[PDB]
Paper text:
[name] is a non-enzymatic protein that aids assembly and activation of the replisome and coordinates helicase and polymerase activities during elongation. [name] interacts with single- (ss) and double-stranded (ds) DNA, is loaded onto chromatin in early S-phase, and is essential for helicase activation and the subsequent recruitment of replisome proteins, including RPA and pol α. An N-terminal coiled-coil (CC) domain (NTD) has been implicated in [name] self-association and the interaction with Mec3, a subunit of the 9-1-1 clamp (Alver and Bielinsky, unpublished results). We show that the CC region is necessary and sufficient to explain [name]-[name] interaction, and is capable of forming both dimers and trimers in solution.
To verify this region of the protein as a bona fide CC, we determined the crystal structure of the MBP-CC fusion protein to a resolution of 2.4 Å. The highest quality diffraction data were obtained from a construct spanning xMcm10 residues 95–124 crystallized under low pH conditions. Surprisingly, the asymmetric unit consisted of a trimeric assembly with the [name] residues at the center forming a parallel three-helix CC wrapped in a left-handed superhelix. Trimer formation is not a crystallographic artifact, since we observed trimeric and dimeric MBP-CCs in solution under the same (low pH) conditions used for crystallization. Similarly, we verified that MBP did not influence trimerization since MBP alone is monomeric in solution at the low pH condition. The [name] CC helical region spans Glu98 to Leu122, two invariant residues in the human, frog, mouse, and budding yeast orthologs, although we did observe the helices to extend to at least Thr125 in lower resolution structures obtained from a longer 95–132 construct (data not shown). Most importantly, the high resolution of the structure enabled us to identify the residues of the CC interface as Leu104, Leu108, Met111, Met115, and Leu118. This interface is entirely hydrophobic, with the side chains of each residue interacting with its equivalents on the other two helices through van der Waals packing around a three-fold rotation axis. The conformation of the [name] CC trimer is virtually identical to the isoleucine zipper variant of the GCN4 CC, with only a modest divergence at the N-terminal end, which likely results from non-hydrophobic heptad repeat a and d residues (Gln97, Lys101) and/or the MBP tag. In support of this, the [name] CC trimer is stabilized at lower pH.
Numbering used by the authors:
A (entry chain B), C (entry chain C): 1 to 400
B (entry chain A): 0 to 400
Amino acid sequence: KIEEGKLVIWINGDKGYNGLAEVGKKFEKDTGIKVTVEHPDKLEEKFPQVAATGDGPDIIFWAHDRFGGYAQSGLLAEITPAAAFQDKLYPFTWDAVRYNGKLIAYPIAVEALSLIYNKDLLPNPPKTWEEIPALDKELKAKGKSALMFNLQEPYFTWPLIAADGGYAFKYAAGKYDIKDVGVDNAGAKAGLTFLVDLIKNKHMNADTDYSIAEAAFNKGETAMTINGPWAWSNIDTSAVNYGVTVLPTFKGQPSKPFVGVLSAGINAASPNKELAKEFLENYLLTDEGLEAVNKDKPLGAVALKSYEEELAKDPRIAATMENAQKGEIMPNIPQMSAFWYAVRTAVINAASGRQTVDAALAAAQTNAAAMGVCQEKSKDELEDELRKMQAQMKKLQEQL
Amino acid sequence: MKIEEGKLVIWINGDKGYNGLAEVGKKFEKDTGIKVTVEHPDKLEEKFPQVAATGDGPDIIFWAHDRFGGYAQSGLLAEITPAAAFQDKLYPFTWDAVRYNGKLIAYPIAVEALSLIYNKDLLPNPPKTWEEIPALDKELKAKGKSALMFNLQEPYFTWPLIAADGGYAFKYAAGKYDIKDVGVDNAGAKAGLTFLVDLIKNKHMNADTDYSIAEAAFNKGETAMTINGPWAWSNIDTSAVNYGVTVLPTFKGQPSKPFVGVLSAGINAASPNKELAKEFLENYLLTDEGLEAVNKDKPLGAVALKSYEEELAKDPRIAATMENAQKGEIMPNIPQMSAFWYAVRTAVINAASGRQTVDAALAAAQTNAAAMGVCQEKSKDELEDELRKMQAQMKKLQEQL
Amino acid sequence: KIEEGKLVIWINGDKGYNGLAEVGKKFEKDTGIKVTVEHPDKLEEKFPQVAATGDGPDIIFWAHDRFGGYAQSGLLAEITPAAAFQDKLYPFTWDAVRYNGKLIAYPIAVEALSLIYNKDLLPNPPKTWEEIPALDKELKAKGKSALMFNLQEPYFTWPLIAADGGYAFKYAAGKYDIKDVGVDNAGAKAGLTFLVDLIKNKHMNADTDYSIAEAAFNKGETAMTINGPWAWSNIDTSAVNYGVTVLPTFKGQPSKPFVGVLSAGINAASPNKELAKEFLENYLLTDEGLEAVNKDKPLGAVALKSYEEELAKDPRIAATMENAQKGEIMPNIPQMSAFWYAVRTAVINAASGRQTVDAALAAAQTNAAAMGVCQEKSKDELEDELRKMQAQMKKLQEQL
Ligand SMILES: OC[C@H]1O[C@H](O[C@H]2[C@H](O)[C@@H](O)[C@@H](O)O[C@@H]2CO)[C@H](O)[C@@H](O)[C@@H]1O
Ligand SMILES: OC[C@H]1O[C@H](O[C@H]2[C@H](O)[C@@H](O)[C@@H](O)O[C@@H]2CO)[C@H](O)[C@@H](O)[C@@H]1O
Ligand SMILES: OC[C@H]1O[C@H](O[C@H]2[C@H](O)[C@@H](O)[C@@H](O)O[C@@H]2CO)[C@H](O)[C@@H](O)[C@@H]1O
């Protein structure tokens, strides 16, 4: 059950949810309809579970890559923007939320990873990944490190993997070929090998996550990090004088980050579809709406032409757009769940030394494609559950 | 039941005329000295493949033809080789229903299709459309009655509504089924199931209603209509209800499309009595006298035997049965039908009970019906069930300390 | 994990590991590099688990059928022999270790099963399988038996199954069709049915394994066995006067043994790749090298042309090559593991009487052409683990 006459919206905890809530306050002030903004953990996984039961938020925010899966699973309502409203947003952002001929979400903003560097610590950032090892050695002598970024989410290491030729699904003849996966070719192998070598050579730690990497950079312990626009706000609050720039090259090739369009989908089971449309079209996707969210945590290059004309003047947004141009807009196909899970497992296993880069990537190629009932994620969850049950069994055998 | 030589053990579903079939068995025993045992175990369609795979089970198994391609593919059925003269006694289309990869793998017995069964005293003019059923129920509720009750636990009964406006199992093209093209989640399938769920949401039907409850309600004059096959008419006759058998209601102006079954008799690949089974089936069951004995117990539908069917076809209930069959389709017999049926069974039950939305339930069913295999939906369900049970046992055990 | 400046080699326990170590000793005297030969149990399964973690031997020996799987999994280095060396080996043996255009191992020897018979007990061996039951009935009256061979490994029963039409994967239109499996056709079924009838009629025991059959033949208790060239050494040391000959026919058709090419692969994670190449090319694959291995346990028909010209004069080798010519060289494709596991399970289940031949083979056809993550083997392991956990629960409930 979803309460009628109210809007519940879910958005990730790294985004400007407090700003989104202000927009909700304006909506409530004009209409009397309460808006509740929440940022639950494991959002992208939680939504498909509750939505399938007819429960969950009225509106779900995530990058566009998950939306095809949601739509295929019967979880999203088709959105019906009139022509005039569709002209307010960039066409390519609409393309990102089109699934099987139908618009399945409202595009909000374009996200791409950039290299973020400490200006005082490193006035001239490296153009290549190759020179990072020597840079780190010099900084260790000063009690610092070259680079820390999230190694637990494949999103962040993907630009290096794609740099020299790695790809997700081959786009051929108007479609993605789910039988043609590129996570195990020579370029992908070379990219991940470099990451793993950085860790082998004590220039990076395999255990480093989002939180640890952010804290190290914002406290001035590391000279560089890799992140998107949402992260700039916390860096501002800290004392670090930072620049946002083009990602380093690898083997002479640009890093190719996967570009995301933060998007707003409407729960198929919502009894407030028309309120959701009004909130999204008449309140959020306006100059005042996006500004409020942006002021909280920066959105990137927004989908709304009128407000983007302002943000484009920002050099950090230019760097963001340069990096996006060098990458590719993510597919939204249902198979993106398997791809992301496969690559997540490979990077983590290779980085920790449990699998070689080659073994890990060969397995990722297999898992990214395809099947359904017994996916890699499912087998892993089962094996974890069995281990947990075994543990309980031993503690019970002990008390017997 | 490690299949004794020199005896016949027969399995048939409990809704069928097993007592009548036993009379045929008795006649067989008097002529040949070979004892025939007819049994009707619960869940036989699932029990047969399990026990037959070990060389156990009945010599002869009765079920609608849709399960038989799977049985045959799994190596459980003997190939049937009737002489030309015998094969000519049965309609060719009924033989098509039991032909798998060029081989006959059962004897066809009878054609089954669902019809709308209505109480003439309670409802002299039955509804032509599903759409007018809510208002009909509203009138009948005021008299302490209801419009319609039928088995909502078996997707067989709900499939006619789902298929009405465009739902399908596997796409038929160029002479074969494309098992990668499943149609349980298109606009028509979704519209049909949504209508059913809306019937439940608006309290015109109850999600818990099963076969025995719907039958009792109709035969007691408590509900104006039910949906059932010919095997059901016998108990209605016995109840004395003034009933008619008629065309299913339309949905969105389109006929309901029941999946039609051909009741069939297969021979266990492991039976050491294959010749006795053949003789029983050809020279005893598939005669005018044989089928009549079964039919007198529970009606078979339109039988496969030409000579006996020319007599039955004159019955208006059989004409209605054939009209509904023509509006539906004879089921595929391909191995993938068990996955299809299980997928739809889960979807209908989950949506009717409110556990899943109609759209989520059918989208997963579309996925599950096309599951290549080794890890099927059913196996996944059984695994999850087994784990929760073990978790439950541990919770009770930790509690005891 | 893998020591640099040293070589560790793994080879199966039935092969001439002592003889290979002698080659290892010769390598060490000339180069100063220590060579360690090991024969761990369950080598074919143990290698991919340890190699995937960057551990294991530098060199792995096994028949070529598993190598495509090892290579697909990213466990094998491409070998770089160069033209002149390749000319020393038969072209068809190079074909056996070529995977997706690359050489992924060095071929060593061609192995095929033969009929091995006691000349004193049975001076004229049966030409057909059909005449074996009557032979056993005659021999049992003398306190002996006609035939015992390993019934636990599908390798040994495969020749009978393939005789009348059974096949693994159809080689059609230039490639193996993993969707066209032939273990459930009329020929496969007729072949397995005959085997099961032998057992039902007490001419054989379903539990008979490699060790039991070998001991039975070498103690003069059974008149015939089925084995490869490796087994002759132990027979020589026994008192049995034996002959090696063409396998019996079935329904007028030759038995079709699956032919293996014993091969040496190089662990992708090895830091001694150059040492391994020099070892394999300049020490093992020479006349003295192979002869040293051969004297310990016979290799069969070797891949090195110069030494085979010698071995070919041996009538036992002529028999081996006659049977090999009547069979087919195994595919090396990754799918061969599902195939072997599928068939292993079918033969055992049918032979034991737990399933009918038709049910077991029909299920094998399905398993051999599996998907990806949920293989038959995984399911079996899952079921095994559940049964154990269930047993523990009953044992705890028993304690009250
Ligand atoms: O790491 C895999 C993950 O990458 C992307 O998620 C991003 C998201 O797009 C950003 O807005 C930000 O929150 O970082 C996330 C990574 O932690 C994909 O959108 C997501 O589907 C995928 O699983
Ligand atoms: O509900 C799924 C079920 O439908 C059919 O079973 C019918 C059967 O054909 C009729 O003779 C009668 O007994 O009712 C059954 C439904 O309860 C399919 O034949 C069967 O395979 C399928 O599971
Ligand atoms: O039995 C299945 C098994 O057969 C082959 O293994 C052979 C091997 O090739 C021989 O060299 C010798 O050691 O006997 C083995 C049988 O026990 C296949 O090569 C192997 O992949 C397969 O599992």
